[PDB]
Design a protein around this ligand. Sequence first.
Ligand SMILES: [Cl-]
Ligand SMILES: [Cl-]
Ligand SMILES: [Cl-]
Ligand SMILES: [Cl-]
Ligand SMILES: [Cl-]
Ligand SMILES: [Cl-]
Lengths: 269, 266, 268, 268, 268, 270
Amino acid sequence: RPTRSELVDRFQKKIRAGEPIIGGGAGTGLSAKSEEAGDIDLIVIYNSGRYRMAGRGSLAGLLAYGNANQIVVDMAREVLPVVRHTPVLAGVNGTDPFMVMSTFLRELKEIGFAGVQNFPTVGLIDGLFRQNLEETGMSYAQEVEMIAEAHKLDLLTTPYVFSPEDAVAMAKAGADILVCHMGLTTRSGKSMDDCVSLINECIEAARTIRDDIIILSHGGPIANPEDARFILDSCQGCHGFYGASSMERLPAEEAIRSQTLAFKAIRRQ
Amino acid sequence: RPTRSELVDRFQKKIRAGEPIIGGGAGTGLSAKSEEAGDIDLIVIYNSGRYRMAGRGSLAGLLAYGNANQIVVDMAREVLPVVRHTPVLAGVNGTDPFMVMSTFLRELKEIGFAGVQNFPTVGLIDGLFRQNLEETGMSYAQEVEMIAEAHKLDLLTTPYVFSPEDAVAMAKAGADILVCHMGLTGKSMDDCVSLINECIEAARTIRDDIIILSHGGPIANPEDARFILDSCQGCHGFYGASSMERLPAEEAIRSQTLAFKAIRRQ
Amino acid sequence: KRPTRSELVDRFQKKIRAGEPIIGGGAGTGLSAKSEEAGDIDLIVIYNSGRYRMAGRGSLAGLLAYGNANQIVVDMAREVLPVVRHTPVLAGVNGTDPFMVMSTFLRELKEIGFAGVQNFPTVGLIDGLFRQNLEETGMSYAQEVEMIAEAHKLDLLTTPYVFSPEDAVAMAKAGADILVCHMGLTGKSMDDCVSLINECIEAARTIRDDIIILSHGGPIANPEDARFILDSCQGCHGFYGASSMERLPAEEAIRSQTLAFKAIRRQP
Amino acid sequence: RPTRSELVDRFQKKIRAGEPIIGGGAGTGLSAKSEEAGDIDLIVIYNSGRYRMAGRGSLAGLLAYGNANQIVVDMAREVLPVVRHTPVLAGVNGTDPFMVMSTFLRELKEIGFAGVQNFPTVGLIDGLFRQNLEETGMSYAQEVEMIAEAHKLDLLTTPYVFSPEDAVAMAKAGADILVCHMGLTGKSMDDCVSLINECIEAARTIRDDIIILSHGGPIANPEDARFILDSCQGCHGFYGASSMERLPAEEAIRSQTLAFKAIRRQPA
Amino acid sequence: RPTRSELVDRFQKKIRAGEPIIGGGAGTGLSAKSEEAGDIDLIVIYNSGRYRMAGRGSLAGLLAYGNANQIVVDMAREVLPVVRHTPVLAGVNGTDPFMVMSTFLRELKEIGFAGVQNFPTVGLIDGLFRQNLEETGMSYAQEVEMIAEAHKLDLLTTPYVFSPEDAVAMAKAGADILVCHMGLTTGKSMDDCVSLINECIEAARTIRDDIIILSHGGPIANPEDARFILDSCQGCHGFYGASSMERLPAEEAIRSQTLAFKAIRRQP
Amino acid sequence: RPTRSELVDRFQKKIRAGEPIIGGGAGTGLSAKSEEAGDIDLIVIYNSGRYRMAGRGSLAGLLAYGNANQIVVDMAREVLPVVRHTPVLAGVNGTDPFMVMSTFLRELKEIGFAGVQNFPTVGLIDGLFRQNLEETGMSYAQEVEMIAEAHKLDLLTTPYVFSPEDAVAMAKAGADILVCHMGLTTRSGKSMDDCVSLINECIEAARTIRDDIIILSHGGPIANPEDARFILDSCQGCHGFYGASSMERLPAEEAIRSQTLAFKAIRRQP
Ligand SMILES: [Cl-]
Ligand SMILES: [Cl-]
Ligand SMILES: [Cl-]
Ligand SMILES: [Cl-]
Ligand SMILES: [Cl-]
Ligand SMILES: [Cl-]
C-alpha cells in the first residue's frame, strides 16, 4: 500500500521524464478497470461519476438528489476491488453539515482510498447564490480546511481550484496536486485563451508558496487529448490533465451506440 | 404508454419487413440511453447488468451477493427516466422465496416496466446442484409460473428457454418472445443451430406466431447472430447484454485513456 | 372525506372575498405543523429545508448534495400528516430529480395523504452561469413547471414558487392554483419587491384571472412587511413564511426560557 | 474538548457562587443551538425530545414506536455539529437487549458525546408491568450498570433516580449528577420536596459532592424550580425538556402564525 | 382467497362440532409453517414473536427497542409465502403516533394478511404509567378504533381484551374474536382467570351472542390449563398461545438434540 | 474473551479425553441460546440458518435472494448478546466481489465473532456452472484466501472442504477445524460408503500438512446422532460433527407441530 510520499515521487519521476500525469473519474467499476488498463495515473470517484454513467449531466452531483459523501462510500464497493495498482481518491463534499470531516477522512483512509478531492465543490457555483452559500456556512474555505485535515492524515490531496486565491489557500493546506478547474466541459464558458491565462496565473500563485506543486488542468474547453496538449504547450508549469466526462462517458456512449447499430444492421441472406 | 399488443405488432411488422428484432441488456442509464440511440427494439435491466458494468463476471448475478429483485427496482430509477420511446423490461428472479409474484409483478408494471424476463434463471445452473434446487423449491417451473402471471397481467414476456421442454412450457405460459439461451460462454455454433431449431419446432407446436431470439454460447458478435438467422429460419433476432454494453465500453475507455496518456509537450 | 382541490380553492377564495389574507407556512417538524394549525394557518408545506432549518442549518443546505430531497419529504410525512387535522399539507417536490419518475411519485404523494405539491428545492433560487449550465443540461425550471402540470392533472393542489413574470406565465399555464412570488433568500429592496410582484400578478393575469398570489422571501420578514406588500400589490392575497413562521419564533422562545430558568435563585 | 472533571469543576464553581445548574433536553439542532444561546449548562438528547418536537407525547419514547439507541445516534449528526461550547449527553436505553453496552458507550464517546443519561428509563414505569420487566431482564439495575460502565469510561453521567434507593445505586455507580425525577411533567409539590430531600440525604451517605437537580411532575416552570431550591437545601438546579423546548416553541409558532393571520390590508 | 365471513363460518362449524379454536403466535416462517402442519386455526405475527424467537422476553415487544408496525410488515415476507391454507394476522400497534391508521390497515390487507390484532397493546400496562398514556393519546380506546376501522375494511379482527369493559368496546367495534388476556404467561390465579373470563363472556354477550372467545396468558401455560378454562368457562371456545406454541417447544427440542449429538462416543 | 489458542486447546482437550466436538448452526437467537443451553462446542451463524428458520431450503442461501455478508452482520445483534460462554463464528461469503476481505474480517472480529467459516460456499456447486464460476473470479480458492487472512487475524477458522485438494488448501491456509461436507443433508446424494471414503481421504490429505488438525463431518446422509456415530466408528481421524438443519430446523419444526396438535386435541369434559 504505497504512501503519499511514494505516490508524489512516482509522479514527479514521470514529470521529469517528460510524461504527463493523467487522472480520471470513474463512475463504475468497469470505468475504473478500463482506466487502469490504459495506464491512468490516478482514479477519482464521486457522485457525479455515477450520475454521468446514468446518462445525466455532471452538475447533477451538486444538487439535492442524494448525499454525495454517502454515495462515494457506496461506490467504493464497486470500484476499489477491481483496481489493483492505481491510487483511487474519494471526492469529498467538504461543506456537508452532517459530516465530521476528521472522522470521515479516517473512514475513507481505512476503506482504502489513497487520497481525496473536494467534490462536489461550491467553486463551480457563482452569482448571488454562491455569495449566500459562502455567507451561510457552505463556503470554499470549508473545502480548503477539509483538504488541510486530509493532508495532516497523510492522504494524497488533489483539490480543484478556480482562481490564484484558491491556488494559494490549497497550497498552504498541503495539496500535493492542484487541478485548475475551468468550469463545466464542452462556446458557453471560457475561451481557450482565458484558460491559458488563468492556469498560468494559478501556477505563479501556487509557486509563491511551494515550487514543487503538481498542477493539472480540467474542464471548460479542455475536452480532448489535443486540447490537453495545447495547454501543456501553453502553460509551462502545468504537467497533466484530469478528465471524467472525456474519459468514460463519451467513449462508452459512442461505442454502445455503434455496437447496437451493428447488430441492428445484420440481415438474413 | 404502448400496450403489449402494440409492442408485439411493432415487432411482427419489422419481422415482416425482414428486419431483425434486437434486444439488449442495460446495466447503467448510459447503456440504456445509448442502446435507444442505436434504435434497439427492447432493453432489459437486471442485477447482472449492474455487476458487468462493475467489471465483474455475469454469473455474479446468480449468487448471494445481493437481492436480484430489489436491485432491479433500484435500477429502475436510473434507467426508466432516460429511456424515451423504447420498452424496458425487468429481469425478475422467479424462484425468490421472499417475493409474492402477483403483488411484485403488479408493482413492476406500476413502476413503468413494459415487461419481464426470467433472470436470474436457474436454467443456467446444472448438475446435482441444479437437481437439488429443483427438488427443494427453486425450480425453473416457478419461473414458468412467474411468466404466466406476468402474461395474465398483460406484461410483455421475453423469457430465457434452454430446451424444447422449456420452449413448450413457456409458450403455454403465454410468452410473447422466447430467447433461446445457449448457456455458458461450451456449445459449438452447430449445436446451437440444432437446439434453436428444436425449440422453434417445439414452440410452433403450441402457436405459430411466437417470436424467437437467440443468445449466449458462442454467439458473440453480429456475424454470429447473422449466422443463426441464416441457419434457423424461425429465428427472428438476437438478445445481447455483454456483447452490447460491456466489451464496447471497456475497449473505448481504455483506448481513450491511452490517447490522453500518450500526449506530449511539443 | 378529505377535501378536494376545488374545495380548498373555494375555501381560500371565500376568505379572500371576506378580506382575510391567505397565510401559508413552512413546517420542518411535526410541532411546527401542529402549532401552525393552532394559529389557523391556511396551508402547510413540508420539505428538506424545513427539516434542515429546524436542525439549525442554513435554508440553502436543502439545495445541495447533502441528501435526496424527494426521499426526505416522504420520510417527513409520518411526522406531520398525523398531527395536522384540518389543514392541507403539501409536499415540496424536487422537479429536476433525475431519478424520479414524476407521474408515479406524484401519485405516491397523493396516496400518502398530501393535499398538494410545491416545487422545492427549486433551481429558481440559483443564478449565474451555474444556473445557465443547469438549464442547459437537464435541470431546468421548465422541468419543475412540468412537474406542476402533472400534479395538476392528478388534481393535486399546486402552489409553486415563481421568480419572474416568465415563471408566472409558465406556472399559470400549468394550472397552478397559487403562485408564491419568491423574492430571494429572506438582496432585493422592498420597492424591487413591489415591482416584481406586480409584474408577476400582471403575467399571471394574461393567462387566468382567478389565480391566488402570495409573497415570500427577500426583505419580507414579518407581518408588517407582508402587509406592506398587500397594500402595495393589490392583486396579492397573502404570504408564505417558513423561516419567519417556525425558526425565529422557536429560537427566541427557547433562548428566553433557558435564561428564565437560569435566573432562579435560592432565597438565602 | 473538556474532560469529565473539567466539567464537574465548572459546575461546582457555579454552585459555590450560588448559581443553579440548568440542564436542558433537546430534540432538534435548533433547540440545542437555542439552549446554548441561553448559556445552558448541559444538553441531553434522546427520542422523547425528537417525539415532543414532532408534536407527540413524552411517553412515546418509552414504547415500540422506534429504537431509542439508534435514534440517539441519528440525532448526533443533527445536534453535535451546531453545539460549540456546551457538553451534550446521549440518552441511552440501558435495557436494550440488542445493544452491547460497553461497545455502544464507547461509540458514543468517540462520536463526541460528553456523557450519558438513562433514557428511556424503566423508572417511569410502575405497577405489575414494571415488576414483570424487572423479573424478565428489563430492570433499573441494568441502567445502573450502564451508568457504572459509562463512568469507568470517564463519561459524564446524569442519571434519573426515582427514589432514595435509586439515588444510592446511582451514587455508588459513580454518577456525577442525579436528576430527581417526579413523574410526567400525579405528585404534589410537597410530595416532591420530601422525596427530593430523601434522595439528597441518601446520596449524601455515599458522597457529599454529588450534584442534585430536580425534574418532572408539578415542577413546570421557573417559579416551581425556585420553590424546590428554596425547599431543598441540597438541590442545586433543574433539568427541563418539555418545559425547555416544547412549550416555548409551541406557543411562539402559534402566536407568530396568528400575528400573520391578523394582518389586514388597507381598504381598496 | 377466503373472506372474513368464510373464516368465521369455518370457525363456528368447528365450535358446533365441539372442537376448540386454537390460535398461534409465529415469530419465524418455520414457526408458522409448523403451526399450519399442526392444523392451527389461525396465526398472528408481531414483534414479540420475533423477539422471543431471538431469545428475549415477551415484554421486549412493548418498549423502545424497535418500531412494532415496521417489524410486522418486514415479517410478512418471511411468513405469508410459507403459509398455504391458514389465515395469518398482523399485530398492529394501535397507539403508534407515526401511523396513519387507514392507509396502514389498507397496506396490510394488500400484502395478504387475513386480519389484525392489537399488539403491542397498552392493555398489558398498568399503574399511573398506564393512566398517563391513556391521558396523552396512547390509550386502549385507539386500539379499539383501529379494530373498528379494520372491521370496516373486512379484515378479520382478533383483539386482546383485559376486562368486561374492553370486551364490550371491542364487541361494539365488530371484533370477530376476543382474546381474553390474563397477563404475562407462567400473576393472576387460575381462579381469578375463570372469573374474569366469565365476566368478559357475559359482557360480550350483551352486545352479541355469536362472538368467539379465546383465552390467553397468565397461568394458562399448556394444553391442560387451556382445557381447565374450557371446562370452567362455558362461553369460552378456545385458546391463543404464542410463547407456549413456538418458544418453549423449540428451546427444549434444540437443547435435547444438541445433547443427543454430544452423547455419541466412538465404538471400538 | 478467549483467544483462538485457548479455544483450540479446549477442543483438543475433549478430543484427547475421547469425546466428540459438536458444532451447530443457529439461524435465530433462540437457536443459539438453546445450543449453548446444551453445552454445544461452537456455533456458526449465516444466511442459510436464517432462511431455514424461515421455512425455506438450505440452498436459498447460495442464490441472489440477498447479500450473505450483510445478513451475517445483521444477525450478530440477534445472536451474540444471548450467547455467554460459547464461541460464535460468522459465515463469510469468500467470493463476494464487493467485500474487501481484510477490512470485513477485522469488522467481524471487532463485532465479537470468535471466528469464521466459508459459507455460502461454491463447493456446493458442481457442473459446468461451477467451472464457469471458477474461471470468472468466483473460485473456492478465494474462499481459501479468505480463511488464510482470517487465520492471520487470529480468528478461529472452521472451513468446509469437499475434497482432499480442498483439505490440503485449507490446512495450508491455517484452518483450525475442517468440516468435511458431504452435500445437502438427507437415494439422492452420497451413500454412507462414499462418505466414509471421502472423509478418510480428506483426513489423510490434511494430516500430511498438519497432524493435529481437527476434522468434523457434515451433510449428505449424516442426519442424526447414530449417523454421526457411524462416521466416528468408520473414520478414525474424524473428531466430531457439525449440524445445522439437524440441530435447529428439524427439532424445532417437529416440536412446534407436536405442541400445536396437543392444543388442537383438547376437549371439554362429558
Ligand atoms: Cl419566511
Ligand atoms: Cl423555504
Ligand atoms: Cl420539563
Ligand atoms: Cl402462550
Ligand atoms: Cl433444504
Ligand atoms: Cl445438518
